Amino acid sequence: KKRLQNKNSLTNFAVRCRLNPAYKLLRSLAVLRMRKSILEKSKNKKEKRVQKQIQKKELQKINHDYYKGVAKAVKKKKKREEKKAK
Amino acid sequence: LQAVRLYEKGVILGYKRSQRNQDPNFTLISIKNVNTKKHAQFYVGKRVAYVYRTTKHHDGVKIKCIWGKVCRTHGNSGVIRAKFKTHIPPKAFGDRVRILMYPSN
Amino acid sequence: AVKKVGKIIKKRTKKFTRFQSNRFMRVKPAWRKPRGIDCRVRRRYKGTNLMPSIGYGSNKKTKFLLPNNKYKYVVKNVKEMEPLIMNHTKYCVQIAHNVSSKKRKQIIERAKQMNVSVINAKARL
Amino acid sequence: IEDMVYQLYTCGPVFKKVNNFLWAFKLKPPRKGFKAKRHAFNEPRPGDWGNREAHINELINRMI
Amino acid sequence: MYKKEYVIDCKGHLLGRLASLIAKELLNGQRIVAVRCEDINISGSLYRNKLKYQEFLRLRTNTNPKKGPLHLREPSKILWRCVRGMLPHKTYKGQLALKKLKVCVGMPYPYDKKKKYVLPSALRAFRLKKHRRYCRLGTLSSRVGWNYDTLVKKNEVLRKQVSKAYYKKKVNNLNEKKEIKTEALNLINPEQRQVLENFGY
Amino acid sequence: KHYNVKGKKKVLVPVNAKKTINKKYFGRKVASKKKYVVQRKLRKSIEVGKVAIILTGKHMGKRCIITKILNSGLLAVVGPYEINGVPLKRVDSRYLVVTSTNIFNFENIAKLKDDFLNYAQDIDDDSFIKTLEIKKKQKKLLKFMNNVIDKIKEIRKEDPKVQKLEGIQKDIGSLLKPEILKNKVFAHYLKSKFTLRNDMVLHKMKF
RNA sequence: UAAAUAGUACCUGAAAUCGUUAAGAUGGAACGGAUUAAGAGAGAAAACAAGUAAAGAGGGGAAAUUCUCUUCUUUAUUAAAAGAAACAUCAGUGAUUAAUUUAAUUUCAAUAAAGCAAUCCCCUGAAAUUGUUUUCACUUUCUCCCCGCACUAAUGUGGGGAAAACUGGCUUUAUUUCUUCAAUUAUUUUUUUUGCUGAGGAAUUUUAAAAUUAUUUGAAUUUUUCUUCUUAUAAUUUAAGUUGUUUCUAUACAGUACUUUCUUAACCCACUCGUCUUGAAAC
RNA sequence: UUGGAUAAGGUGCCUAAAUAUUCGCUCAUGAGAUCCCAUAAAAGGUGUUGGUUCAUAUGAACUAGCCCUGAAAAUGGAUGGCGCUAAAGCGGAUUACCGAUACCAAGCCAUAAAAAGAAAGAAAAAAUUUUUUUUUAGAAUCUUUUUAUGAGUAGAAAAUCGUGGGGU
RNA sequence: UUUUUGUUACUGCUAAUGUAAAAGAGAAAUUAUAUAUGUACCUGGUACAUAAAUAAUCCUAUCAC
Ligand SMILES: [Mg+2]
Ligand SMILES: [Mg+2]
Ligand SMILES: [Mg+2]
Ligand SMILES: [Mg+2]
Ligand SMILES: [Mg+2]
Ligand SMILES: [Mg+2]
Ligand SMILES: [Mg+2]
Ligand SMILES: [Mg+2]
Ligand SMILES: [Mg+2]
Ligand SMILES: [Mg+2]
Ligand SMILES: [Mg+2]
Ligand SMILES: [Mg+2]
Ligand SMILES: [Mg+2]
Ligand SMILES: [Mg+2]
Ligand SMILES: [Mg+2]
Ligand SMILES: [Mg+2]
Ligand SMILES: [Mg+2]
Ligand SMILES: [Mg+2]
Ligand SMILES: [Mg+2]
Ligand SMILES: [Mg+2]
Ligand SMILES: [Mg+2]
Ligand SMILES: [Mg+2]
Ligand SMILES: [Mg+2]
Secondary structure (H helix, E strand, O other): OOOOOOOOOOOOHHHHHHHOOOHHHHHHHHHHHHHHHHHOOOOOOOHHHHHHHHHHHHHHHHHHHHHHHHHHHHHHHHHHHHHHHO | OOOOOOOEEEEEEEEOOOOOOOOOOOEEEEEOOOOOHHHHHHHOOOEEEEEEEOOOOOOOOOEEEEEEEEEEEOOOOOEEEEEEOOOOOOOOOOOEEEEOOOOOO | OOEEOOOOEEOOOOOOOOOOOOOOOOOOOOOOOOOOOOOOOOOOOOOOOOOOOHHHOOOHHHOOOOOOOOEEEEEOOHHHHHHHHOOOOOEEEEEOOOOOHHHHHHHHHHHHHHOOOEOOOOOOO | OHHHHHHHHOOOOOOHHHHHHOOOOOOOOOOOOOOOOOOOOOOOOOOOOOOOOOOHHHHHHHOO | OOOOOEEEEOOOEEHHHHHHHHHHHHHHOOOEEEEOHHHOEEOOOHHHHHHHHHHHHOOOOOOOOOOOOOOOOOHHHHHHHHHHOOOOOOOOHHHHHHOOEEEOOOOOHHHHOOOOEOOHHHEHHHHOOOOOOOEEHHHHHHHOOOOOHHHHHHHHHHHHHHHHHHHHHHHHHHHHHHHHHHHHHHHOOHHHHHHHHHOOO | OEEOOOOOOEEEEEOOOOOEEOOOOOOOEEOOOOOEEEOOOOOOOOOOOEEEEEOOOOOOOOEEEEEEEEEEOEEEEEOOOOOOOOOOEEEOHHHEEEEEEEHHHOHHHHOOHHHHHHHHOOOOOHHHOOOHHHHHHHHHHHOOOOHHHHHHHHHHHHOHHHHHHHHHHHHHHHHHHHHHOOOHHHHHHHHOOOOOOOOOOOOOOOO
């Protein structure tokens, strides 16, 4: 066959759907879930905080303990070496 | 008093070049009040006119023009590269050009 | 320098002159390939004469057309221009140099009847 | 085409054939240049030639 | 660089930085007039610059010194030759540019009544730390045989007196005009007065 | 008509196909094989009563009032001839710079918007193209150098389309002049022309 | 004499070299390659107009007598095509400025109220192989007192000693357009202004399919003016490599416009060829 | 050939692009300015900047960065030149930019390879269902279409251009 | 040495043009840089006032007849 212009397979919708027969569904789902969010502004960004209070306070103690232990071990090595110097 | 201006002034510098090579397809232009790269991008689609004089008459008149376009900037100081329909003669490198405002946005 | 009128494109218009032909008058301008060590034209130094190459070739679809956009056929007498009655929109005629005025008049007035154009229908008049 | 994406992003059973099926990619130079090809990525200087683990994505988005 | 002619007084500038900023203006196409060339500064001790000039003076064409390097010791010609060494003066365009510069010692008539500008990126006050050493071009040129340092100062004194009288008259005129202005604001339609008030005129 | 791809909603209008080309190995055909085309979609500052400046033609620098979107991209203006000296005229929006000032914000004029719109329905895109017979009549005059100009000006005066357009021009001018002249500074604004002074830089100006 | 610029140094009559006239250039060589400009000479074979009507001169073919075909005029009627420029549309390839769904990673910050400790606090430091446990240091204030009584760089200051919790730190709410909601990564969706390019022309793969729009035949789910699944017909292109509208050339026949060849400038660049030689611009 | 974006190196002028930003050091009456590369040592300094030890915030010793002494040749001369000290110098860091006949996208020439073909029929436009234009192809080392590639002395091969004479 | 119109038979000729840069090509204190300038008094010193992102400013331009 005679060669023709090569079409951009990512920005040309017809060829994109020709090559990927499942792209239309995924794009539609993403667009729906994108509009739902903006229609619930002044009503979102509130629940996020009330559940952050639910779980981040549980994760906070574990994280704090981990980093506290790391810093303490780093200090212990320092004192042990300084005393060894004398 | 008369004969309104309606354009911004400019001087035609040399060609697009390196040290020792020439490349006369593009020409470098300086604009009067423009001295940053961000401000030069403002003019990135306008039409350029180079008007000069001759000694004989050619079609009843003694003036002719060469038309061009503003294509891009030239880096950090508000200079531009311009593309004309024909290459500008090098006996013009300090002359005047008119940076028009026709294709308005 | 590229020259283009309609669909015809010429990739260069200047001739390839022979090296050293501007300095010695026993050297003619017709192109000859430089051979021999230490030339500076054979070795492609910048700033000297260029060499021809197959890259300047013309499009196959427009390789022999005149600005008339027709091919040229050269005729010597009336009987030779009769094959042009079937292909008159793609060819144009030119009369040879050594035919007499009387013969030329007849060739011209037949070309006019056949609706074919004559490139040099002004000579010897 | 998504099948080849699947077989490339995970070394699926059909990887030799899928990979051998494709012409080698031909890429532009990167948009903001290199640092120094002479030197290595892990040298304390600007350099390139090492193994850069996940920083390859940044480079190949610029020279796509 | 969009003007018929620029006038620069060089009192207080460093020689190299000034000479570099003039050459590009000349190449782009711009007339420049430079005055008071005897007040240019350099960035070494005066002795260190006298030694450099002595090195410049002893190189000459052995077989015939009429040719060869020509040693010009007026302050204006020194700047002229320093600018010449930053232009491609051996082509045609670069010779055209070199002819669009004029230099003077002092400040003769046509330019004593014109507006003078300065180049801040070449001023000694902004470019040289205060514990470094520096010299004046007039003193150096006198040390190598110029012989006109005193007359220039003698003329500058008179020029300054005349300028002072002119400035007094100018200040009087400006005050007299300010009063006439402040009176006439009361005699205009009120809305023109608000529109001038809003935009600070 | 319109097609909706990725939520864009481009508008379709009919188009004709004119140019013909050679076939490969028998007789010719027409080149274009489309039937519709996308409309122009002008920029979001062209209103029905704003003042604007002409940049190119004989009336360059003058100010005018934009009147109608002429169904073919380019648009009709009038800088009322009784006030300014500019007739009904067709211009391309690319050769105009349009300010932020609207005629119908002055409450002294806002009560004329409907009647202004009623006259503008008759302004037609065809009535600006001159007929072939007028062209031939004007070009016959080239076969003194002062009678010809008057003859050319006179022949244009009996084109019926010109007369139809003169009627609308006069109607709009007579309708709109009395309320414009009540605002003195604004009438003087419309009577002057724009120009560039030094110390205004064109990439910091808003207008 | 047909011819003497065929006159006996006699057919034609090249180059090197020199004369005449005209036009140009010209600060210690000249000529060149690339690219344009200004002058000058020449040019119509694509660089507009078929045909129509009238009259004048001709040349042929058929059925000395009627049809029919063509060339050249001269008048006055009339299309149509082509090349450029501007604007718009689409596709391919770039630049440029504003955003964005979900999640991960020790993040913060502000407004109402009530409290906690006082060299004390979230931290950090000095002491008596990891997790505890103790000891003493860590806050400055435009407040007070003593001494030097103006001593300072300071519209304050040097030494000594106290008070308070305004400031700083920590708890419990109930709050986020007073204010904050960052940064990097993973995974997704858009957006302002603009540069360059348009190969081809499908008597049966420019089909099929895909997308779109408007009626439908049924099911889901994400519950919806871009929600999915070609489970029925019509059209369209985003599929199946550029199309359109105005103007000019111009109501021309070679003009100062367009094509072309010479001449002379500018800007960048350019050592003398052939030969032997590892190596040549070579003293 | 037309666009785009780079490498090696550069961004005070010559010379296209930063008199860019952000930290330290240096003053030279012979400063210094980066592969090949176009020279410098032992030994010294109470110049200035950091650091390590021993001695009631003062002494001593030591160490290593820039600078200085050691440091003399023949025509007048060379960080490439001018010049440069709130660097245009030396050691770092952060960004932007400029720059190949190399890299990417598209057109065209040629070379190599490939997919095919030896059982043929109507398309527009201009004219008020009548005429007018243009085309209506089929050569085998041939005709359509697709992809990759292109340096060259000594040397080898193919196709092509021209001259005196002979047969058709 | 006011101005109007132009430089679109035969010998070299005897009417005759250029431009490295017009589009508001606008702008006269001096002085210092770990400070300046102006005024009154006394032989530079007292006293007062003013500038201090000072071209990031000021001045000019359309209202025909
Ligand atoms: Mg060179
Ligand atoms: Mg040729
Ligand atoms: Mg060799
Ligand atoms: Mg780099
Ligand atoms: Mg190597
Ligand atoms: Mg040169
Ligand atoms: Mg028309
Ligand atoms: Mg004979
Ligand atoms: Mg001489
Ligand atoms: Mg209390
Ligand atoms: Mg031998
Ligand atoms: Mg050899
Ligand atoms: Mg030898
Ligand atoms: Mg040799
Ligand atoms: Mg030698
Ligand atoms: Mg290129
Ligand atoms: Mg460097
Ligand atoms: Mg530069
Ligand atoms: Mg000591
Ligand atoms: Mg440098
Ligand atoms: Mg760079
Ligand atoms: Mg080869
Ligand atoms: Mg022979």
